[model samples]
Target chain A: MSTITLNNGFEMPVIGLGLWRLEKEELRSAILNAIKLGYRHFDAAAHYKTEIDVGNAIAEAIQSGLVKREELFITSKVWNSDHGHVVEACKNSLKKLQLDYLDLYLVHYPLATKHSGVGTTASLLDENKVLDIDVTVSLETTWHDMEKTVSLGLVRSIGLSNYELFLTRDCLSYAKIKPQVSQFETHPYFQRESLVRFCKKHGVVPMAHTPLGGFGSISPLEDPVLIGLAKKYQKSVAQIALRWNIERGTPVIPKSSKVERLKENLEVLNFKLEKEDIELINTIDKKFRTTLPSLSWGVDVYA
Target chain B: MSTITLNNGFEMPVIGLGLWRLEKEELRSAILNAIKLGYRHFDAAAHYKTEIDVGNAIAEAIQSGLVKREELFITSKVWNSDHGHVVEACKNSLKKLQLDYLDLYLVHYPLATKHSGVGTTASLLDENKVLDIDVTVSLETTWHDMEKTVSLGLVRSIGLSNYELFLTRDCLSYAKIKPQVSQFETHPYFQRESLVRFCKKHGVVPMAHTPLGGATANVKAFGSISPLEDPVLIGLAKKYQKSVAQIALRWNIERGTPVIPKSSKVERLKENLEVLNFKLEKEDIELINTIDKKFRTTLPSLSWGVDVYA
Candidate 1:
């Protein structure tokens, strides 16, 4: 509903649809339905492993006159494994998305790992422990290559994801092209005010992933506290969560397969949360981190 | 030697001795010899396990008419394990050094580790895995405690050591007392030009540890090459007829880094102090700098569980 100009002068829709853990069939319909419902931004990733299907859906929507590619803001990420293969990864993402170029590209996570082509769920529940591997690479090397991606016009802008204060500082010191945005998990349960302030100071736009708490099918929608807040605000639980992010000047991406909820998630721009309501929701700061499982991976997911 | 007045208005000798691994017996004699040779600053630390000997040496040096306590600048560090007990640690250092207070107290390293006590040498080479415990705390908690030490008058100034750029930026955001100095391994071999420039831009004085090379006894010293081995440096040393160590220390001092060159040998101490006598030509300085490999002797990344860059 609203747009923010990136540092490189590319306009980005304030709200987006996140394609994490979405089924191919569900994602295909969600994208087609979202564009019809006025959602302009679509966030995807190589790690999500649904780019081909999502791209097909976007192509069908374009051919059917649902929306033009120019009207859409398509964003994708280079996974840790492809961190070293910047050009090839960008080309593959462009090819898979059925688009000439992406509006934005991001480093999925600071941790670079060997991509096994398996889903995160498998890695999250690996039994042998021997199957677990760390493909962690330095941020410096990945960021330099990310700059090359921008120079080649594969993406309009580049950004960082899941970075802490120190890592952000290190990136800024040597980054030829400063990161335009930093996407991380932000919800009532984890406000991260200090980190937000730090990022804002350096002109890095804050983009909220897991904006409606977390992945739609995951544990957050079932959260008692979030549901209670939803009822109290006279809005859906997802609406209350999405609105809270918008009030904080952070763009949010909430994914859903249901068309009604997708429309409700976009309606967040209409009703702003009051100061008292925001503070009331802020009381839910339990440091609840849900996206990346740390115990299984031996890395601090929130960091 | 040029002197820089600290934020607290006390003059500090721009150059000093870095007693990282100096033996307790040798520390006393080294301090006394350095003072007799006109070295006014003695940088000591609690983790070095030689505070008492260094204190005794300084006290005895003064009592024996070597130099007065007021005329000298002494610095000590609050070890990582003492982050929670900074006030107690400062008092302990004062007692061991037999001094009323220290001129400066620094946070030894960003990552906190167990205090190795006053005499124990926590062996990093134990293959049996018996002494692999890390009792270190976080830098934020330790830095807060360091501020309490300054309020207690146990320390006149506060500083940081072995901090990378990001860690220092974090400190700038949170520190109630700005770091007056940052000491790290700095030599022609590991020139850290960007780090030094960043410190200068922020108004924090950069101090060089391992100004000549580094703790040569460390295992890295065998595989690593020193600035003294550089052909350009060797040629300059021969041209000036000075020891390569002196040439390297002088280079750091001219570049605005207060260098601390340590030695147990009294003759080497005098030789090191004589670095103030000559300045290198600009061309020669540039020639020597070309040999930089960014070599580091005491890289903190080798510590377990701690992400080096993080």
Candidate 2:
């Protein structure tokens, strides 16, 4: 896999195993399977409910001399509920993951939901069955606290996820330590070109999630043009799509449980598409989105 | 009433008469009335098609001893399709306005659209019967042409309109001539305080477009409308013994962004000018800042998967 160098001289692998829904023994085997397949990066979050599995898997791998702790890059996220207490929340993930330090830590969303008994429980509604919002906190205050993560050396790099240009630029201006990466939703169908270009121009790496669009049959692999092109290139539709983003200077983190599927994703770096093929795929941008989640900040990020 | 010095050494009045929907002789009479009421700045656009009306009214004022040519600040816009052809488009506006020079010229949008003739131009449609979009051009090329207007002496100051912080910073980094002013949608309800601070930090003045969040528009349907008649503004008006509109304009101006408030009534125009005499207290400004929900006031027309604001 190709790699991207962060602002502070740490090189991150272009692709990783994303842990979104995987849990327990399934998540453990998946992490070991990916590692045996030469994958070096794994992304986890406090909201994903798989921190102990990640910690135990790494413990299993390192204990056996199958993999060293220094050989892998582990990434974690601080959820919105713990945004005000960013340092404490990051330490919580560090402890749960059973690691001395993290390779990267990210702010999951730009806005804050009210703390539902703290510790990454992002349940946003109150007992009244209404949306709960905390008014005393602003994103700027939370960002200042996120900066402390980097300074404290709990993580080697700190970044943001699910942010727009407006909020990202706000953090960029006020940041004592700038964001090294911005993980966002991107696909061939909903290519936010301006946003991606902005991140690169400002020395921030753009990492893409939902790289294959999603699981099973509902993924963007059904497009006829994508299928025809996939055959011509002798690759799967998902591989074709993931390779497209890798060429755009963004790293793709795709998730999978099966061993063969993980091997198919890792083989994307072997072949490349031509310039005309990339532009042909660009014509299909209908602004179709695979991920519809938002910040609940009373405005649509899509709008 | 008060002035902000432009980077190009032009003194722009902090408050101006916004000319969005006014047209034909109605626009001419508005300019004439504003001049008679000591208003010195007028905002127009090529899309607004009020240059001829602006020119006619200014000529009448010059002949009537109401105002001198140098006393008024005339500003107009270059629309989306006219991005690369800003020189030709700007000269066309000068011809219609009957002026040798404009005080300011603004790039209307940061991005281009396929304009297939709706209002100022012709009748081409993209099956959706809305504004067309031009996709081939980028803002860098468009802004490169905008810098030429400054050297050509066509306008005293050139700037941008409706640019967010990202596009604004992009222009700031590579611009041969810096953008002097950035007019965007700003009000108490949608106070982009961070955006306002970003522009000011970069030496680009932040000008408010829907300063009063006008009485009619399509933007109110989507989000929280700019509640100009909100009780907080009314309470401030009562405390200051001024109209709610005056207090609203002051709220933006005192926070450092220039305002362009459109008024059809001549009495309201006079009242808008009366806001400069008093100062809002520091505590009240903080109270007003809490009303921000980051609400948007202006919504654009979408046709063929493109809209100006989108």
Candidate 3:
């Protein structure tokens, strides 16, 4: 796998497996299957509830001598509830993943919510269905604790997820162990070109969370431009979609439960799209985000 | 002077004089002239570098018995460099403004820069001249100190300027004293209706920074559209027998947001304040709402190199 060096000189794979929305029955085997195919990066989070299963699969992979720990890049996020408990939350996530450290640790969202306790990823809401926010804690304090994890050797790289422009700029400005990655929802439809460029300009690698345009009725896969490009490049639409981001120097993590689809996703590293074709794909930008964070948290963190 | 009640139950005049870019030559006189014209509210900031002159004018006004200190509303801001030193910054602003306490004190911008000390409003630069930003301080810590100003009686109210929705929401959630006001670059061209409605819904009064489409010289280079030149506003001005600037100010006043239009000339000052005399029709107000193209003329990003609004 091709690797990009982080700000701290750690290499991260440009392609990764997204571990969100996976069925519990298929979690371990899907991870195992992904390992068989050439995925060296696995993206998971505390909110996903698949850390233990991912751990089980990783343990089996190591026990069977399939791959060594150093060969893979593992990324996980700290949920909104644990903004005040960065160390404990990271430790708990490590214990569940059965690993001593994570490759990259991310602050899931900028806002801090009422603590639901350690080892438990629970969200509390007020009577108005708004997330119970803890105003006493500051994001700066949470970041300081995040920095402590880096010094303690619990995480290799620290980054941000779902932070918009201002928050990202603030984080970039204040970070001592500056963020090595910035993960957000990026696809052709909702192409945040300015944000992506801003992250790259600051040497923070931009990682796409829903790189495949997500599982929405409005898929970039079905875009006529991408479809034509897929045909012209003799690649699958998913391969073309993933290739465009990688061409622009961004990493994409597309989630799939099926082995054939997973194998097809891993094949994107072989071919390179022409520059004009990449420009053609950029023209399909509709500037709309498929996933609305407001549905889950009742607060539009993006807004 | 007609006044609107703030969330803290203090009255603030809907019309005020913006003290940004005011010349040192005319600063004291413009402030004194505005005071004589029934303008009780004066918006000044550390970034404007006019607090000292504004203070001088207010001192003269009180000394000559033109207005009592309690009858006026004075607002000052803690500049970007002083985010880590909010209490001292507030005190310094009070000293510079020649007042015991301010009616409202605001965080100038959400971003914090490297400390240039409390009173020295300097913008430091690296080799490339891009602003040397201070990442050590968090806006959350700054707000806590802003709250302390209210508790310590350094200011009667605390609020935000140039903070967008998420930052405002975070402040609202975390605030102990709760921000009573939110001032930002609001005009017909960049009418942030959602943000305005959000602030109002949360009991934070929204105040307009560039209520009359900013100064023409400041925005002309950006290829900016001016509300003063809009045909709709021009027609409304002719029908209402008021200037286009007055029509724009009246539209903002009728929309339940305060306008702080800046003018050195006494005639223009009176013209701005006359927005209080007449009400815009419901249909005309709705017509002005349709003119919102969401075009922002104040491109702070161009100079700062970071689009805070984006």
Candidate 4:
């Protein structure tokens, strides 16, 4: 796998697996399968509620000699409820993940929030239910605590998610350690070129959350544009989308539970999109936002 | 003068004179006098319609051996009407300034407009008259040409003016060359802490334009809570017997940023420059800044839907 050097000199795999809505029962098997197929980087979150199981799978994989502990790069986030508990949250995530340390930990989102409640098996599919409640702590406070996590060696690097320019500035002014990465939703429909450039110039690596365009149970399939582009490039629609992200110098994590889909998502590294194809796809700027849960604030989902 | 090293390793004067609305006739003499008074930087613009005279004064200053051409730092701008013709407009400014290159050049505003014919002197001060008709180009296109100017060497460094957070991001993404500075209206009443922090973190120097709250014309004044009337700042000004404007300028300078205080009167100009003599009490600085109302002087109405810089 190709690697990108973050501002703080940590190496990140150019591609990784995203675990947004993956079930706990399925997580161990999915992670084990991914590790067997050479996936070393895993993106997790406290809100995902599968860290313990994912950690077991990782530990089992390491013991089975499929991969060493040092070879794997683990990333998780402190959910909005734990905004004030950054240091303690990092410890909790580390313990649950069954790892001594995390490669990266992010703020998850600019706004702080209170945890609404734990999800039941049936409630996981409910898009309108509030998973987190917006709390009133400033991003600067959260960022300061995030930097402390790095200084204390609970994580190797710190990053941001869903941050606007104003919040980014607040963190910049008071942060002793700058964020090395920013993970936001990026796809052909929502190019976010300006934000991508801002982060790049400031030496922040851009990571994409929904590179395949949308996640959730209800997104209508059979996108004609994605299908045509995929056929044009002689690749799958997922590969075309992932390749578009890679062309913009952003690393993308496309999530999937199906074995064939998972393998197909990883095949993005094998193809390159022509400049003309890239520009054509760039013009497909629909600004579609699909991952927004009830936890989102009043702000528009897509700016 | 102390200098700050730009990201590209060029040295910029830490202090400069701003010429927002100096009359065309008086501009030459004012610039000349400023040159004589140990001032090495003179900020002018095409929008002011005094670039020609400012250029004349610089030429005379250099020719009379009052200052060397290399010792002076001159700044100019690409006005709204000239957005499409930025390169041509910059060349026109160089011709007017009687210099081959500008030390710094900035986009006058993120919003663009069609050039209305130069208004009568009466209209310049008319509060009701619209200055220019708004017709904006995409910030990305303007930034593309801005970087081109650097390659052509028409200006040594490029910066932005009157821009907020979102517009800055647009410029950042599209420009091959990043802006070195962003000049905005900043004062005790409108500290713009978020924007300043954004610039600093991104390695862009923040230049305070209305460092003294407002100018004498009252053209740029927006709010009732004047920095000049603030109890804390006024008390400090009385303790030093310094004008409130001078104290405000010093406040910005002491915060580790540069400022350009515009004044037409020679006495006020001299007084504004005298701020380097005294320092404000830390408590007084905090007290004065606490009276902020986040007033903005040059808000373009066209920026209503742009969520980039609220």
Candidate 5:
């Protein structure tokens, strides 16, 4: 498997299948098809509630002799409310996924809104103060529990997602186990140059969540620059975009179900964009984030 | 003077004077006039090149018996390039300001760059690899020097600026001296509510830099539309019978975070200070937040033609 070696000695697939909104039949079909198309990683999260189907797809695929389960990288995140019940949450996610252990786990975001230990990504608050907010404590506290999961042999590696420079830096400074990876919303339009560089300098692998822009957003497929680059590289707009992230040393986790799209995504490894072209795509940045969660419900995690 | 008591037992004025981009005659006159207008806190930075004038005005005011040294809270910063020499940099700032001591000295930015010695904010990078950029050093190293300055008695307080929640939290975890204040750009468009709340939750006094949506450079960088013209701001201004700028500054004061709004006009200074008379309703404060786009109306542009913010 082509992989990026994490600082902690874990090898994560350079290209993983993102499981954000995939569910029901679409998820099972997508995961099975992606595995057949040579996808070795599945980016799952508890917030998506797709762990059950993701688990079923992997278990069925492995049982059917498609691939060994140990060869694949299965990543999931601890939900916001689950920050307090990390061990139980991690085990429950594993139970839902039907896996003995995960390759990697991440704290979805540093902030924690109040939750009664289930459902939806997060819960709302009436105090206005705690809305989309953190439990009245330091994220440092939550991170300690994440480290405990690694110690308990529950996960192979632990990392963070949606963490900016300061939060990532602080975690790097204070934690006993250094974060192996960081995932965030990254697309050609939202090319966070400084943030990506900061993660690199700190030995954290940057994983792009929405490399092609999320559902119904401005698809890079429609962009003239992507089209031109696709033509120049003799690749699809999606491949050109995916390769752009790969060339920058960050992994891409695009979510597409159709077999043709899955096969096309796997072919991004066939060709590489020129340095000049990567620099040009860098300029096409509009600073657009496709998935900036609103804080009106309680807390704006990005803030 | 409304104040936010620091965890270190130091009280900082809630409404301070921002001295970024102020120069020469305007800088001195603005500082002198602000003192007369009842503004006792002055925020200065080595990167702004305004400290000399900031110090001069304060020195002149004290020498002329206009105010006592202890009556005023003068704050300055150690620039990014001079970050490595935090002690010498603090001494250099004190010499320029002509002050024996500063009320507070903050690290201008969490990331430091390599510069020859004095005056340059940061040097340009060669081919995206600030080959000169020292990666071997750590921010903890810079922070250690920050703690050293306090021990040297150069400043009464130490804090951080442009630090995000994670950086502040990390500093709180390890630093022997807790950060007393956190300075960053905040406005109606870029509410940064959680960050401000986090700083307060950690006993760090948050300071807003562009409470009035900044002057010109910010407009050129973030957006040209003045947030003061928003209908909600206009609505609140009318309800309170106060100027739109007053509504803007008071919103930040209401957040428990003090704001530093710069003004070159005596009329504008008076209008900015008169806001202390009224209080925005809790509902109105939440309503004002409805317009928050989480838009940072500064940064994103670099004269060096590099993508610093992006």
Candidate 6:
């Protein structure tokens, strides 16, 4: 229900739906239902393979007078394989999403890999069974092409996701149009306070991709601190977690397939956390991470 | 005094005479005197304009039978302008240093700027008096050329300076030969804990430049009080019967990162090389870590108009 303004002056809904790992069959219904629950920002990426279904759902929403095209903010990412083909990849996502332009576009990760076909999302491995990284393409090369999307009117804003603080700072050093949004993994366990504070201080809107911290990592919802707070606030553990991020001025995008969960996530804006309660949660920070790129890519990109 | 093994098979001296701002007139005698004083590693750079004098001193030392050529390690850097022509720049430094090969060569910074001629080290400014950065040459491009230096037998090891953790990680991703060393500004005040840990975990030796942190630009910009003046370092200095600067150098040496504190005078040069005589306690090292303000004093942005540390 609350909104944050990006560096480029676009107002974005603080709560959005994370489009990663959404089931193929439930994708269309999830988007339609999330829109029904007043979730305006839909975080989509090419790697998710949900653009076609998401495009069709949005078309249905617009045709049925459920929501106007301008009322919604759609975000998509250029995958690692498409670092050299950003314009083409962005256009392909737009074609699949059935949109003329996207609200936000991002480099999914500050990585470059050999190009597969546009929609394949194939994991290209070398003879050694590791990811076949493309050495020719640099991040600066990719960033300059990201800037072209704005000039071409294909994207209203451009940004980075999963970039470390140093990489983000390097982006700011050479960026002609500063990144409008910085999306990364954050939760009570992995607060990333310094990185989050750096982003907000630099005028980039910090968006929490995994604000609940339940995927492959221990869930903060099970913590006694959050459970007790949820009981006192008369809300679910998820609402307290989402509200905690909002209180810190970081936007949260917690994904759920259940219609009730989607409704519950959007309901967090009504309540506020006490300052001491916020400080108490901050103490639970272990700097833990659920996402380890090394398992798949054979390299710790965060390191 | 002590030695650290690089990822490559070469072992580098843990402490070296940093050759950043030595006086031109005293440069030769200073290096010669240092060689006489049991210093075997000299950190010379093309950007610092000390290669010619350092070359002369090393030659005199070798010719006078003071130090053998094989017994010493020499390090130099490629300036920002000559990244595209790394082999040429490296060979020019070799010619100036009077050496057939360098023990180590480093990228002065991760930035690429408009090319000035070799050995000039001119600050190529734009029409607005800012650094005239050349965007077409990426760090990957520069790194590939740096790898050429080793293949051409101009350098025994290669590394980076003034690079952040992510940039350093990116270098490792594309590097055919991994960087053996990383050098940047590290002292008690700006410890760079994560970066130092990452480099060590990845087997890249982290070298501390400006380990004493007395660059004039830093003092004028941040009004930073020297780590030598800090009471905590002073307390440890007194407890160990060591000078404050020696305690600061020992803290990094204790962590296995090498230090290159520049000095030309006999007393200070003698004092800098004395770090290996004692070790900071485990708790004393922890005490130094608490002094971190995350303050970087040598920001190139003050002149270049872009803070790479941002």
Give the per-residue lDDT of model 4 (tens digit) for A57-167. 888999988999888889998876677677888888888888989998998865444544332111121233333323235455667788888888788989988765434
* TM-score computed on alpha carbons, candidate 4: 0.50
* C-alpha DockQ of every model: 0.03, 0.05, 0.24, 0.03, 0.24, 0.08
Say which candidate scores most in TM-score. Answer: 5
Candidate 5 structure quality by residue, lDDT tens digits, B1-310: 4787888898888888888878989888888888888888898988887777778888887887778888899888987677678888888898888988889999887765566576545554656543234443356677888899889999989999887665665567557887888998898888888789878876889889888774432235554776787899999889999988899889999988788888877888888877777899999999988998676766623544334444
Worst 10 residues of 3 chain B by lDDT: B214-223
- Report chain A TM-scores, every model: 0.87, 0.93, 0.97, 0.87, 0.94, 0.96
The residue-level lDDT of candidate 2 at B41 comes to 90
For B1-310, candidate 6 gives per-residue lDDT tens digits of: 4788898889899989888778576788788888888888899889887788889888999999999999899999998888777889999999999899999999998877788988777658787665666654667778889999999999999999888666876787768999999999999988887678768767899999989875321235656567877899889989999888899999999998999988777887788888888888898899999998656666564676544432
Over the full model, what C-alpha lDDT does candidate 6 score relative to the true structure? Answer: 0.84
Task: Give me the iRMSD of candidate 4, please.
Answer: 13.7
Clash tally for model 5: 4
lDDT of 3 by residue, B108-199 (tens): 88878778988887666555666666666777788889989988988999999888776786787667888988998888787887678668
List model 5 lDDT by residue over A80-134, tens digit each.
7777778888998989999989999999877665666654456656554455344
**Cα lDDT, model 5, residue A239:** 92
- Identify the runs in model 1 with alpha carbons over 4 angstroms from their true place: A1-303, B114-138, B214-224, B300-310
Q: In model 1, how large is the Cα lDDT of residue A54?
A: 84
- Measured against the true structure, the TM-scores of the candidates, in listed sequence, are 0.53, 0.58, 0.75, 0.50, 0.81, 0.63
TM-score (chain A only) of candidate 3: 0.97
lDDT (Cα, tens digit) per residue for candidate 4, span B1-310: 3566777778777668888767766676677777777677788888677877787788888889999988888888887666667787788888888898998899987654454333211112113343332323444466668777889988899999877654564455445777988888888878887677657756788888877764452456465446777777778888878887888888887776787877666777677767766788888777776887666654434432232232
Residue B247 in candidate 2 has what lDDT?
79
Superposed by TM-score, candidate 5 places the C-alpha of residue A197 at a distance from the truth, in angstroms, of 3.7
TM-score of 2: 0.58
Better of 1 and 5 by DockQ: 5
